[PDB]
Amino acid sequence: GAMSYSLYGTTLEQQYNKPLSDLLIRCINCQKPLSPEEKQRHLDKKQRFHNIRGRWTGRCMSCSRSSRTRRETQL
């Protein structure tokens, strides 16, 4: 279905019926669209992100690691 909430990415393929590989998906701090690479963080390592209508917001590598430095424009 859909609503804003946080979900295990690994399960997102059922969610929208349009998977990560199709869903515009972006970092949460970056708003940078994460590709299958950073999506696989949420799939493989199953990092929990947020689900949004038509897209979402997750954490790219930089952010999934350096979460302590929370900036949206990173400067």
Ligand SMILES: [Zn+2]
């Ligand atoms: Zn990021």
